[PDB]
Structure formats: C-alpha cells, structure tokens
Amino acid sequence: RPRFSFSIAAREGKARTGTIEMKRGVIRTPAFMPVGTAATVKALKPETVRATGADIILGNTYHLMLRPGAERIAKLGGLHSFMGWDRPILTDSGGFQVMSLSSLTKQSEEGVTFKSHLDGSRHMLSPERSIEIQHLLGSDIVMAFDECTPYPATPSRAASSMERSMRWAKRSRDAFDSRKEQAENAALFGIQQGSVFENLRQQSADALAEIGFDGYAVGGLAVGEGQDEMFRVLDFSVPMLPDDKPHYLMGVGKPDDIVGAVERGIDMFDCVLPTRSGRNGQAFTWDGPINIRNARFSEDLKPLDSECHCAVCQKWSRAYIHHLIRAGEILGAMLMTEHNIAFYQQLMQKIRDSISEGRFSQFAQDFRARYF
Amino acid sequence: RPRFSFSIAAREGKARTGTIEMKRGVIRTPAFMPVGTAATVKALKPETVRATGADIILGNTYHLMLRPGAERIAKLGGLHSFMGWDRPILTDSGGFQVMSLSSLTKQSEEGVTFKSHLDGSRHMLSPERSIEIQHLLGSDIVMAFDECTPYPATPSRAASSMERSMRWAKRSRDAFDSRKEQAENAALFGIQQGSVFENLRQQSADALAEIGFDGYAVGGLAVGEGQDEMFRVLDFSVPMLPDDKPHYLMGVGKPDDIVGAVERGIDMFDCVLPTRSGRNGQAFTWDGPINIRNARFSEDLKPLDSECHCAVCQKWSRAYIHHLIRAGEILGAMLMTEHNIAFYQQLMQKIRDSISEGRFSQFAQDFRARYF
Ligand SMILES: NCc1c[nH]c2nc(N)[nH]c(=O)c12
Ligand SMILES: NCc1c[nH]c2nc(N)[nH]c(=O)c12
Ligand SMILES: [Zn+2]
Ligand SMILES: [Zn+2]
Secondary structure, three states: OOOOEEEEEEEEOOEEEEEEEEOOEEEEEOEEEOEEOOOOOOOOOHHHHHHOOOOOEEEOHHHHHHOOOHHHHHHOOOHHHHHOOOOOEEEOOOHHHHHHHOEEEEEOOOOEEEEOOOOOOEEEEOHHHHHHHHHHHOOOEEEOOOOOOOOOOOHHHHHHHHHHHHHHHHHHHHHHHHOHHHHHHOEEEEEEOOOOOHHHHHHHHHHHHHHOOOEEEEOOOOOOOHHHHHHHHHHHHHHHOOOOOOEEEOOEOOHHHHHHHHHOOOOEEEOOHHHHHHHHOEEOOOOOOEEOOOHHHOOOOOOOOOOOOOHHHHHOOHHHHHHHHHOOOHHHHHHHHHHHHHHHHHHHHHHHHHHHOOOHHHHHHHHHHHHO | OOOOEEEEEEEEOOEEEEEEEEOOEEEEEOEEEOEEOOOOOOOOOHHHHHHOOOOOEEEOHHHHHHOOOHHHHHHOOOHHHHHOOOOOEEEOOOHHHHHHHOEEEEEOOOOEEEEOOOOOOEEEEOHHHHHHHHHHHOOOEEEOOOOOOOOOOOHHHHHHHHHHHHHHHHHHHHHHHHOHHHHHHOEEEEEEOOOOOHHHHHHHHHHHHHHOOOEEEEOOOOOOOHHHHHHHHHHHHHHHOOOOOOEEEOOEOOHHHHHHHHHOOOOEEEOOHHHHHHHHOEEOOOOOOEEOOOHHHOOOOOOOOOOOOOHHHHHOOHHHHHHHHHOOOHHHHHHHHHHHHHHHHHHHHHHHHHHHOOOHHHHHHHHHHHHO
C-alpha cells in the first residue's frame, strides 16, 4: 500500500464513502476511531477492538508523553508494538488536553508550558515537540499542533487564536517534512479553527490549503455550543476544505451527531463516549441508550440490543451485565465497552452502505425516528 | 457421561492423577479451580478461563445469595446460563465467608444468622438452606454446610465444632438426597474438620465415610497455621479419607502449597491468590513471583514468564503490563489475571504429567529448586 491515498467511491449530497489506504492498513470512511487513552482502549484487548470492526484507533499524545513517556515508548519499539495494535493509529497533537487537564499552563507564541496532572513535572509542548513526540510514538496519522479556542469566543480572540494556529500549522508541516522517516511513512492533518465565525473559518481553511495537508480536521467544535450551532458551523465550514482529502471532526461521537456530521461532509470521528459510557453503565441501542443499572433490567434476559451482532449480545443478558455493573465487576466494564464500540462500528457500517447505495438520507431519517 | 465418576489412572506415593466425569464435563485431577466470586472470574470472559485450561470453576454461595440472589439466578436459568460457563461448577456452602465477611452473626445448632456486608439485610443460612441455594444456582458439585474452626483452637472447641459439623453433614446429605433433581444430576462433598488434632480428624473422617459422600474435602486448614503445620496435618488426615474418592483441600493455592498437598494425596484446589494477585501486581513465574510494578520492569521487553504458553506472554511485554498496572488500567488486570490462571493450569498439567510418568518426585524437587 502507499503512504497515503484517499479515494471516494460514492456520494450522496455532501456525504461521502470510500477508503484511506496507508502502509499499516485500509481505513473505511466514514470511520469511527476508538480512543486509546494510555496506550490501551479501556477494558479491551486490541484483537477485541479489531473484532468490533475498527480499522484505526486514536492515541492521546498528552497522556502518553506523561506516562510511560514518548522516548520510552520509542525505545520499546513504538506504540503499535507496545500495545499490540498493528493497524493505523492517529495521534492528536496534545494541545487540547493540555488546556483542559493540566495546570499552571504558560502559553506563548513558542508553545505551551504546563505541569502534569499526575505529579508536578513540567513540559514545553510546541509544534516541533508535538510532531517529534508523535514520531517517537510511531503514529501513522499525525495532527498539527494548534491552540484551541474556548466557547464562547469573541471575534477578536477567535481570530488571534486561529491566526496563531495557522502559524503553528506551518511550523508543524515543516517539522514533519524535515524528518524523512516520518514524512515518508506517515500522514499529516491540519486543523481548521475560527470558532463559530464563517469569515475566520474561511481564512483558516485557505491558510491550511495553502500549506497543504493529507487531511483536514474541523477543530474547535463540540466544546459547548450545542448540536444546532455545531451543525450550522459545519454547514459552511466543511465545504471550505479540499474536497479530495478526508474531513475529520475531532471530539464528536454522539450517534446523532455523527449521522448529522456525515450528512455535512465529515469522514472521520473519535470520541470517548463509547468507552466512558462503559463506566456509568450507558449502553447504546437502536432505540436509544439505556442505563443498564436501572432496576427494570434486573431480570431482563434479552441482549443489550435486539439487533446488535457483537459477541456480548450473542452470549450475555442485560440481567447479567446489570449485575456486573452494579457489583463493580471488571467484566461489566469489558462487556459494556465491547458492545458500545461494536455498536458504533455497526453504525458506521450502516452509514457507509447506505451512502454507497444512495439511500443515506432515508437511513438518517429512519435512524432518528427510532433512536428518539 | 455419568452423574459422577472418579477414576485414578496413575499413582506415585500418595499422589494420584485421573479424572472426574460429570454430566457437564470431565475434570482432570489434580485440578485447580479458578474462583468466580460474584458470578464472574475477576476480569476474564468464561471462554478465556477455559482457554487457560480450567475444567471447572468455583462459585461462592455467600456472595451469590447476597447479590444477585439465589432465587433470582434460578429464575434466570441457573448460574451456568447466567455467567456463560457451561462446564462443571463447584459451589462452597457459604459457611466460611459468613464467619469472615458478614457481621452480627448469630450461631446455633440450627444454623447461622447474619447481616450482609453490602447493606443491612439479614439471612439464616443452615444445612438445608445452603443445599437449597446451591440447587437454585444449579451447582454440579455441592459442598456440605459446616462450622469452620478458627486457628488456633483448643481441643474442646475443635471437638465441639467438628461434632456439630458432622451433624450438619448428615443434615446436608439428607437435604441433598430429598431433592430428586439435585441428587440425580449433582454430586455432594463432605468436609472433614478437627483443627490440627489427629484424633478429631479421625472421628470426622469416620463420620463422613459412615454417611457417605462423592468426595471429601479437608476443611479448616490454611487459616493461619503455616505450611509446616498444614503439611503435618495433611500427613495423617488425607489417609483417613476414602481412597477411591476425590480429596479436596479448600482455600489452598500457593504454588508450593499445591505441590506439597498433591504429594500428600490432594486432588482438588481453589484459591483467589491467582486472581487477587492480579490486583497488587503479582505475576507468577517458574523463578518465583515478581511484582510487575517494580521499576526494574519499566523497559523489560520479555514476557511475564520465559516459558509460559499463555496468550499474554505470546503478545505483551513486562514493560507494557508494568505501565498498565501503574496506570490503573483495566487491561492491566485482565492480562495479569489471564497469565496467573494460565500459570496455575500449566502447573497442574505438569503435575498430572509427572505423576502419570512416575517422575513427580523429581518434578517437585526441580520445581522448588528454581521457584525459590
Ligand atoms: N472537539 C475539539 C477537539 C477535540 N480534540 C482536539 N484536539 C485538537 N488538537 N484540537 C481541537 O480542536 C480538538
Ligand atoms: N481453608 C478452609 C476453608 C476455605 N473455604 C472453606 N469453606 C468451608 N465450607 N469450610 C472450610 O473449612 C473452608
Ligand atoms: Zn452488542
Ligand atoms: Zn503467561
């Protein structure tokens, strides 16, 4: 396979379906990427993640650089070897997590300095260090280092942040290109910023296209603006990005959000919703999510979802999983997580098929009618 | 297969190897039974438990009667269906846990009354209720309800407890036999008591044989007397039990303890050591246990154990598992537990093979030399 090749096989309105070919494997789009926070997709062996249908997973740079550490992972052979996942891995730049998980952060045009939330160590993340860490991890899809804009944001602040992000996009591109091994085996995605302002989104899109990237992400959304507003911004923002490259909506994972985003041209997604929901006890079903801890499921012999083809729904009852979660058993988390990730992958598969068959619109309608 | 059939294929000194045939499957002896506390073997799917080589698992009656509840499990189809394990399951009588986990216990000749450690509910366990609960769970090997003797124990108290236990053994036998379905499909094991006193162990053994059981367990050991003393008691106690029936040493699981117990005629074992050790971070190896959290393993690329054939040692490094455990990741527990249970099963397999080949003595010697 090539270093990177995105091909669109079918379209319906703004929706697209196709594949991204990379050295470590093929990625079917629209794609949902399970999140592997600390070199592990919570409660699942990599083979199980693959069994659900995942083609690629996401790795958090912020978390990994803190522990076990980027250099350490490199010395151990890279992230793939370390965690046992041999297919593509997309790594975020770490910027977002730094501004929401660490403390005593010091921002400047050079980058950001912060103290770990684990202990009291300091770090100086920048476009160059972020790209370097992603190289050390052996990431397949590298994200440019940006400065995220909090919501709500004033035009002035959003412009300043977006402008700095574009300068950082150029620095990220050059850093990536200067490292022969990385430039020849990995791909680089740029991130569009600009908050909810159309003119800023346009300037960002133009700056990113001018530099040139393998893929373009829509950053700065799903940060508190609500679906209505998010959809409104996607309406004019996605068309601004190069049509022949993947469109990645970062941090978006609610089923309905995904369907709406695909309807607006998005090709890639990632979110902890699936996995985290395996904590409180939320299980996704085509009839909407259910909280398995609820007493009504204590003697329910049916599977989590009546149609789901995952191993969990083939072998265990809601009653059993209900018991497991209420008892705080690890198997409870393992089963809930496997089911939720499988559910998301089945959602993506139904989306890909409907688009390829020119019936995505009807699928979106039918999906919403039953899910709500 | 028959309801119950124990056959000894080979012997070496007091050691024996063979099989127990039951409706749900064949059990190779000496056997180690993973413990499924709350209807789950901590952090493992039943298929994974089977993959390690386990032929049978143990279920805790005390825990199950508290939650989800015996009657509820019965209504849901039995424990096997509930948790997804279709092979034999041995259930303890619950007596031991009641005297070590619950509170405000009230003991009498009728049974014991206690309050759950989960909430403040009350329960009245007795020989009849214990047998009934084990029936409701659908247990294959039912344990008689006894009164365990704390260590150390005076001759007088040990005799009184042993005497009450034998009266309870008779009540357990009659309860079991009165329930046609259970008597025709399950097996009943009696439990020898008597603390560390030879004369009491003899009286207990005689009383149990007089009543007649499918198997005989040596209870009251591994409660603080130390291996030396435990071995001394086993020396004279095991020979007192019927030679043609299985000998079960309850609550014994340290590798060396198992080897020594088999050398003294024990055929079955169970202990949480394997699973619990997957918490603190203790991994078993032929060179002795190691604490994976130790800094020396941070960049160790070797598997947990150099010879182990388990899936964990085939795919992940000590370095990775070290990271997982120190990060509190669920996958850490899953991998450590799978490895430890696999290790125990490999230990049992090496024991069975060496006995069948008349070289168990040499194996015990070689095992100890390297393990210590
Ligand atoms: N939903 C926004 C978001 C999630 N993760 C992100 N990571 C980066 N670098 N930038 C972003 O805007 C985001
Ligand atoms: N190691 C002693 C022991 C563990 N579990 C037990 N359960 C019962 N009923 N009796 C016992 O003596 C024991
Ligand atoms: Zn499912
Ligand atoms: Zn192993």
